């Protein structure tokens, strides 16, 4: 009734065959007693790195070990323990006089790739899914706390970005906004995972649009819209110039973190936001160097 290669066919299997399983490991593995072993045929110490797998040799087979009941916790190395720590990811200036946002408002493009510490950590993984907690610390350039009322507004991509302090966009009929005084403790808020993808990508090896990819448009290489969450806008809630110069530091704490595919950790200094460019004339070694290989 039906061709055999179609019946016995396996095209369509949606379940991923996994060769490994995640086991409970709340503490470091214990060490078991070991005695001398003088025999042929069994060679724990000999490996073959070509295979691409790490050595499975254990302490017990290399030396005579005692019994150690290891009760050291492995909890502080979970993804949440590692990433759930607020760090600086943005900094906005609202000076009185200058060429940088001198009209009492600013539009910060949401991108946590502007600061090395936070950036290097997250770039340890290729993909990451998480909720976050944003905290906004505001004050003057001297650290002085001033009696000023500010308005922070999240402008998702597509919404109208304010063009002035008195822009109509500040009506926030739908965008989420926060009104705080610099005298109040830093505003804090919870953000969900808002990407149209299943996770954010710190690395996107491709282009966002089709067509010819000429020199002028190489600016778009590695730009993934699934990571472009919109803009963060700030302003003096008023219609006149503020009496003080302001600064807003943005901190981010990740929660409910999932991460996939680890990568080599940043080796060279960061230069730009949208890419991994490095100074070709100042390529420094990963670490420290010495005089001779036979001397410390």
């Amino acid at each position: 009734d039906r061709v055999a290669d179609v019946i016995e066919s396996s095209i369509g299997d949606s379940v991923s065959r996994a060769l490994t399983q995640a086991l409970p490991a709340p503490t470091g593995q214990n060490t078991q007693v070991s005695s001398h072993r003088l025999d042929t045929g069994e060679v724990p110490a000999l490996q073959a790195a070509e295979i691409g797998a790490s050595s499975n040799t254990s302490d017990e087979s290399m030396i005579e070990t005692r019994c150690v009941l290891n009760s050291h916790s492995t909890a502080e190395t979970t993804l949440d323990s590692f990433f759930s720590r607020a760090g600086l990811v943005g900094e906005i200036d609202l000076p009185l006089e200058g060429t940088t946002n001198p009209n009492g408002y600013a539009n910060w493009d949401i991108d946590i790739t502007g600061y090395a510490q936070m950036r290097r950590k997250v770039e340890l993984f290729t993909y990451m899914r998480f909720d976050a907690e944003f905290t906004f610390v505001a004050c003057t350039p001297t650290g002085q706390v001033v009696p000023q009322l500010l308005q922070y507004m999240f402008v998702p991509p597509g919404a109208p970005k304010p063009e002035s302090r008195e822009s109509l966009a500040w009506q926030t009929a739908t965008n989420p906004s926060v009104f705080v005084k610099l005298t109040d403790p830093p505003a804090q808020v919870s953000v969900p995972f808002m990407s149209p993808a299943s996770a954010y990508q710190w690395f996107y090896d491709g282009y966002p649009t089709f067509g010819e990819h000429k020199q002028e448009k190489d600016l778009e290489y590695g730009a993934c819209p699934n990571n472009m969450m919109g803009t963060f806008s700030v302003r003096n809630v008023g219609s006149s110039k503020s009496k003080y110069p302001l600064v807003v530091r943005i901190y981010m704490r990740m929660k409910h973190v999932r991460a996939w595919i680890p990568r080599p950790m940043r080796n060279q200094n960061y230069l730009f936001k949208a890419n991994p460019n490095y100074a070709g004339n100042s390529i420094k070694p990963t670490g420290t160097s010495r005089t001779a290989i036979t001397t410390l």
Binding site: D13, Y204, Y278
Partner: protein
């Protein structure tokens, strides 16, 4: 365990000096679940006509070679029926079986690191000083089947250490031990399907960590050939053929 045969489609690979097989992240390629999918149109699963071994260009290993790389969905977009489907369809999905082969003699020596780096984004030297925001050209980000040579292998041309590249599915070709590396990669992306033209899921890196060497008289031409086969290929969103 040193010998092996890989048969898929109408192609068969043989080897008598292998070093087992690596299955990237401990997962075999599979088709897309009905709950992981979004595109509502029924996909095409050409099977045998696209899931077979394609042998791309050969490279010459010199005592001074730095290394090469190939972006993957890409290397095949202009070859066989796989390429045609990748051009006619908007969405593509698939795993790969990569087999890098390179043989010498019991008197030659050297070691190649063969690794798979997902989302392998290329960076530039930034004009040397690091003040110029330059970007890699299309010819370098998506080199095609001819692959591309690394200018600064130590940092993988992306500011990251090659010494840690082993956290990725890899294998070595140590001439005194084996003459090939086999790595099976599942479909990895944050989406169930994606464009085979605009996006390159991963990159294949073949880099000499221990320089090739031999005494004058032994054959000096030592090639490195790349053979690869798609697995569980699925395409959707049919239209006219698009090259890029």
């Amino acid at each position: 365990d040193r010998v092996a045969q890989l048969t898929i489609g109408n192609s068969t690979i043989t080897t008598q000096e292998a070093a087992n097989i690596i299955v990237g992240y401990g997962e075999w390629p599979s088709y897309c679940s009905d709950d992981d999918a979004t595109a509502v149109d029924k996909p095409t699963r050409p099977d045998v006509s696209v899931n077979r071994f394609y042998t791309l260009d050969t490279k010459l290993w010199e005592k001074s070679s730095k290394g090469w790389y190939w972006k993957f969905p890409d290397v095949l977009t202009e070859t066989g029926v796989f390429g045609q489907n990748a051009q006619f369809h908007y969405l593509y999905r698939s795993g790969f079986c990569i087999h890098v082969q390179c043989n010498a003699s019991k008197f030659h020596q050297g070691a190649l690191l063969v690794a798979i780096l997902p989302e392998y984004v290329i960076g530039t030297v930034a004009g040397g000083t690091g003040t110029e925001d330059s970007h890699p050209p299309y010819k370098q980000t998506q080199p095609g089947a001819d692959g591309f040579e690394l200018q600064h292998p130590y940092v993988l041309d992306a500011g990251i250490p090659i010494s840690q590249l082993t956290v990725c599915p890899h294998q070595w070709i140590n001439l005194r031990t084996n003459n090939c590396a086999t790595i099976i990669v599942p479909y990895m992306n944050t989406l169930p399907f994606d464009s085979a033209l605009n996006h390159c899921n991963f990159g294949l890196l073949v880099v000499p960590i221990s320089p090739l060497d031999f005494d004058q008289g032994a054959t000096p031409v030592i090639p490195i050939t790349i053979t690869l086969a798609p697995m569980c290929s699925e395409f959707a969103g049919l239209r006219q053929a698009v090259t890029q």
